[PDB]
Structure formats: structure tokens, C-alpha cells
Amino acid sequence: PPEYMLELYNKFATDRTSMPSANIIRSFKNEDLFSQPYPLLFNVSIPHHEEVIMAELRLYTLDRKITIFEVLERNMLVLVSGEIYGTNSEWETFDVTDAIRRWQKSGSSTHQLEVHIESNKHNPLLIVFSDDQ
Amino acid sequence: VDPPEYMLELYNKFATDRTSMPSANIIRSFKNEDLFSQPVSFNGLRKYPLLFNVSIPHHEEVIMAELRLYDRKITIFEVLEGERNMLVLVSGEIYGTNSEWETFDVTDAIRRWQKSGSSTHQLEVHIESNKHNPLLIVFSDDQ
Amino acid sequence: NYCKRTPLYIDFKEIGWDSWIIAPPGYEAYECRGVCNYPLAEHLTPTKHAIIQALVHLKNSQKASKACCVPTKLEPISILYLDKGVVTYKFKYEGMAVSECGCR
Amino acid sequence: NYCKRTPLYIDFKEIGWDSWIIAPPGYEAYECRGVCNYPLAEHLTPTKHAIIQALVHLKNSQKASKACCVPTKLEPISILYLDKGVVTYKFKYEGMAVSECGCR
Ligand SMILES: *[C@@H]1O[C@H](CO)[C@@H](O)[C@H](O)[C@H]1NC(C)=O
Ligand SMILES: *[C@@H]1O[C@H](CO)[C@@H](O)[C@H](O)[C@H]1NC(C)=O
């Protein structure tokens, strides 16, 4: 019961003025919490017939630039990189849709990333919005 | 004989031979209702009228419509109402050897009658040099 | 026993429909006979609501009724009949024969 | 009386579905209770087979069962649940609540 998923149920149950962009919403957890700065690991598995509409990576931060790579073995592949604001920032989302779409095309369901910062139940998680056809 | 032998023959055609099916889902047979008029026949030309109580629902896609009759050339008119107005529906030609029943395409006129109100329409048949009652068949699908 | 399609012939003279139906005199319409006790096999194509209603009836039989064995897919037949006085023939008169039964 | 929709609340813990369903704890699923005797009203959306089966049973019983009062249209509900261990949320989990009853 992640707070985000619970907060998403309560959002669309009370506010009937809006509905999710996709029918199915999955939230995958990070399983590499035994580390200190930091890498992340996800056990993503999505049916191939579902059309991935959008994917968001949710990170917790305590104005700099944050880059997110996909480890491959170091032939690091950049997925998304932006300049976040430091005005009491808490949760920051980054679009990693395309990374998930080719992860949906077979491949090892286990994936590992790494986040770099430039000069606790907050475990980051990855949310995939997908439609079922 | 209350069901025309054509509609009975249609049922038996598609029930025994399941390799074919009607071009439309719904087939109606409208009998002629002018059984007292006599054909006027000048030497070389014969004409006689017809009547039909046609009613097709507006939400149906009319596919085909055949008028069944019987070196002769036949012209089929529609009298719209001297001030009478005769419109040619189909000018076809037939052969003279044991033709028996000849069919004519009056589909355009039927689609015209469907868009307008369900009324009775009067026809005339021009040919130049009981059980045989002409009947009008209308094929339509339930869209 | 279980929910399944059983034979059933319907003669149109028995139900008085021979007045407007010219042909055929009858046909095999079948019917769905049987019980739908939890769990419901997937060959009956059970809906989610039919699954839960059968489950609530299993524990408390007075809180909810049991799922019913009804036709889930119907097939047409060719019918020659009289519609408002005009001789009409439908090659596919839908909804006449049962092809698949299931729990709903 | 007639075939109509009656109330029915389903608590997921009563049926043991609280193990995988996070939210809601329950919902009103309704049910269809009643009889379908000939003639079948058109608000029950009776199929041609349901009409004849109810008609043959009216005249000759024991030849055919009676048409059954089942749900004819189902509605979805928002459900947050565990699908094979991943937290999944469906805004429209189809087939959960009854919206229309009828004779089949
Ligand atoms: C994580 O992925 C592995 C495949 O490498 C799979 O066997 C395992 O079931 C996954 N974890 C869970 C909780 O399903
Ligand atoms: C034939 O047309 C008349 C009006 O001219 C109409 O009242 C009647 O209903 C039609 N025939 C049938 C069998 O409905």
C-alpha cells in the first residue's frame, strides 16, 4: 500500500471531474535500499499487448541538475536529465516512458539505474501508466 | 397460396443450398393491388397499370429492388400525381423464347420511396413490337 | 448436473406462432439447464459479478441468491413470416437458438 | 415480484478478497431477484429465445424451464489491488456492479 497509489485511489474516487490518462497504473518498488550516497533497481514486468502511455520515476530530494542513467554490462545510457529547483523540494518526477517501452519488448525484467547529483519510507518507486487493449 | 411461391422458393433455395445466402438480410414481397385493370393493346404496343402498398422502414439500407413481370423492349414508368407526370424507372430489353418471369431493376425508385413517406405508388409497363400477378421484391439490411 | 445446453424442439403450432410464421414449422432452440455453484468453471464465461455473487451465496445462502444458468450466445435461423401483412423473409432472424450456455 | 435490481453490499473481508484488494474494503454490487413469467416486459430486454422459452413453459410446463432474471449490463468500479505482487490500480475494473436486470 504505497501512499502514492492509495492517494491515487482517493483522488479519483472523490474528484469525479477527472480520470486517469490510462486504465492500468502499476507502481514498482526499488529493491536496493542497502546503500548510501545512489543506485536503484526495479523488477519491471508489463504485458506486451498493453500500450504504455507514460512512465514516471519518483525520487525524494532533501538549483542543481539531476541525470538518470541505465546501467548496462560502462556504456551508460542517459534516460532523462533536468535542472530541478531546491526550494524545499520533496518529490520530483521524471519521464522515463521510452526506457520502459523497450523494456516491455522482452529483455531481462530486472533493470538497474543510477542517479547522480551535481555540485525513511521515502524509497523511490517507478510508476507505469498503461492501457489494456 | 397466401405466401407467394417466389418467397417460398427463396426459403427453399437457401435452406437446401447453404452455399449461398441472400444479398440482404430482409426480403419483402409487395403484391400488386390493381387486379381489375385491363391492358390496352394497340397493334404493336401494350400498356397496363400496377399498384403497390410499399412501406420500408427508414433505418434500413435498401440493397436491391426487382419488379417481377410476366424482340420486345419494355419500359417501366411511374405516374407522379392534364398534369400527370410519367418518369421512366427502367428501359430494358428482353428475349422472346420462353422467358417466363422477367426481372427489372427499380432499386433507385424504391430508395426514393423509402426517403419519402410510406405511400401507394402507381406504375405503368410499356411493351413494343391471379397467380401470374406481378410482385415487387425489396432487399434491405438492418443497419 | 452442471450448467449445459440441453435439447429442446419448439413447434410453432404449440405456441400459436404458426399464425404469422409461414416456414419453418419448428426448429431446435435448445435451452440452458443446470446449476452454478462456486467455483464457476471458465468454460461458462463467468462474469466478475457472477463469481462474487456465487461466492457470497456459498458462505451465507440468505444474503444473496445463486448464479443462474442462462444462454450466453444466441444464433439466428431463416424464417419466412407475415410482417403487418407483407410476406417477409429474414435469412438471419437473430436470437432464436442457443449456442453457448454460461453462468451470469 | 417482477425481475428487478435489489441491494447487495459485498465486503471483501467477508469473502476473503481483502488479501489482494487494497481499496475499497467493499462496494454495492447489487443483484437481480425476481421471476420472468410470460409475457416478458420490454424493460427487461427479453431475447427472442427468452420470450419463446417463457411462452412454451406457460402453456406446457416441464417441457422447458422458465426464463431467468439475470444481470444484463454490468458496471466497473475503481480498485487498487495486488496483481501477482505488483501494486496495480484500475480506474474501471469491469464487471463488478449490476446496472440493468433482465430475463434470459
Ligand atoms: C523479480 O524478478 C525475478 C526475475 O528475475 C522473478 O523471478 C521474481 O518473481 C520477481 N519478484 C517478484 C516479487 O515477483
Ligand atoms: C395499404 O395502404 C393503406 C393506405 O392506402 C393503409 O391504410 C394500409 O395499412 C396498407 N396495407 C396494410 C396491409 O397495412
Locus of grid cell 541525470: A67
Instruction: Answer yes or no: do A20 and D91 touch at CB < 8 A.
Output: yes
> Residue D41 has what DSSP assignment?
P
Q: What is the Cα–Cα distance from C26 to C16, expressed in whole angstroms?
A: 12
Q: What is the DSSP string of C30-81?
A: -EEE-BBPSSPPGGG---HHHHHHHHHHHH-TTTS--B-EEEEEEEEEEEEE
A-chain residues near D22 (CB < 8 A)? 1, 5-6, 9
Locus of grid cell 417501366: B76
Strand ranges in A31-71 using DSSP code E only, listed in sequence order:
39-43, 51-60, 64-70
A125 found inside a domain: yes
Torsion of CA B52, B53, B57, B61, to 10 degrees: -10
Q: What is the Cα–Cα distance from C51 to B38, expressed in whole angstroms?
A: 72
Instruction: Answer yes or no: do A24 and D22 touch at CB < 8 A.
Output: no
Residues with Cβ within 8 Å of residue B44, at least 6 apart in sequence: B128, B129
Count of domains observed in chain D: 1
Instruction: Pick the closest to residue A97 from A50, A55, A53 (CA basis).
Output: A55
Index of the ligand 1 atom closest to the CA of residue A45: 2
Task: Check CB contact of D71 with chain C, cutoff 8 Å.
Answer: yes
A94 found inside a domain: yes
Q: What is the Cα–Cα distance from A25 to A54, expressed in whole angstroms?
A: 10
Q: What is the Cα–Cα distance from A113 to A52, expressed in whole angstroms?
A: 20
Locus of grid cell 539505474: A113
- The strand pairing partners of D6, in sequence order, are D31
- Resolution of the experimentally solved model in angstroms: 2.9
Q: What is the Cα–Cα distance from D54 to D65, expressed in whole angstroms?
A: 8
Count of domains observed in chain A: 1
Cell of C59: 458462505
Q: What is the Cα–Cα distance from B106 to B125, expressed in whole angstroms?
A: 12
Helices (H), chain D: 48-59
Query: Which numbered ligand comes closest to the C-alpha of A28?
Result: 1
Element (H, E) at A83: strand A77-84
Residue nearest to atom 12 of ligand 2 (CA): C85
Cell of D6: 435489489
Q: Are B30 and B139 in contact (CB under 8 A)?
A: no
Sign for the CA dihedral angle at D12, D18, D19, D24 comes to positive
A to D CB pairs, distance under 8 Å: 44
Q: Are C4 and C101 in contact (CB under 8 A)?
A: yes
Touch between chain C and chain A (3+ CB pairs, < 8 Å)? no
Residue nearest to atom 10 of ligand 1 (CA): A43
Q: CA D80 → CA A3, A52, D18, D74, distances in Å?
A: 12, 19, 11, 19
Sign for the CA dihedral angle at B51, B57, B58, B62 comes to negative
For residue D10, the enclosing domain spans 1-104
Q: CA C57 → CA A34, A62, B5, distances in Å?
A: 48, 53, 57
Instruction: Answer yes or no: do D56 and C15 touch at CB < 8 A.
Output: yes
Q: CA C72 → CA C4, C35, C45, C51, C68, distances in Å?
A: 11, 15, 8, 15, 11
Pick from A26, A43, A103, A112 the residue to mutate for probing ligand 1's pocket: most ligand atoms within 8 Å of its CB: A43
Q: What is the Cα–Cα distance from A99 to B131, expressed in whole angstroms?
A: 78
Q: Are B29 and B135 in contact (CB under 8 A)?
A: yes
Locus of grid cell 461466492: C55
B-chain residues near C90 (CB < 8 A)? 25-27
Which residue in C80, C81, C83 has the most chain B C-beta atoms within 10 A of its own C-beta, making it the best mutation to test that interface?
C80
CATH code, domain carrying B105? 2.60.120.970
For residue A111, the enclosing domain spans 28-131
What's the gap between Cα C54 and its chain centre?
Answer: 20
Q: What is the Cα–Cα distance from A29 to D87, expressed in whole angstroms?
A: 9
Instruction: Answer yes or no: do D71 and C48 touch at CB < 8 A.
Output: no
Name all residues whose Cβ lies below 6 A of ligand 2. Answer: B 53, 120; C 84-85
Q: What is the Cα–Cα distance from B54 to B51, expressed in whole angstroms?
A: 9
Q: What is the Cα–Cα distance from B79 to B49, expressed in whole angstroms?
A: 9
Q: What is the Cα–Cα distance from C47 to D94, expressed in whole angstroms?
A: 9
Q: What is the Cα–Cα distance from C53 to D30, expressed in whole angstroms?
A: 9
Q: What is the Cα–Cα distance from D82 to A28, expressed in whole angstroms?
A: 11
Instruction: Pick the closest to residue C69 from C30, C36, C40 (CA basis).
Output: C36
Instruction: Pick the closest to residue B7 from B35, B30, B34, B33 (CA basis).
Output: B30
Q: CA B143 → CA B25, B29, B59, B60, B61, distances in Å?
A: 10, 20, 7, 6, 6
Q: What is the DSSP string of B37-104?
A: ---EEETTEEEEEEEEE----TTSEEEEEEEEE--EEEEEEEEE----EEEEEEEEEE--SS--SEEE
Q: CA A64 → CA A36, A68, A82, C11, C61, distances in Å?
A: 20, 14, 9, 84, 64
- The strand pairing partners of D71, in sequence order, are D101
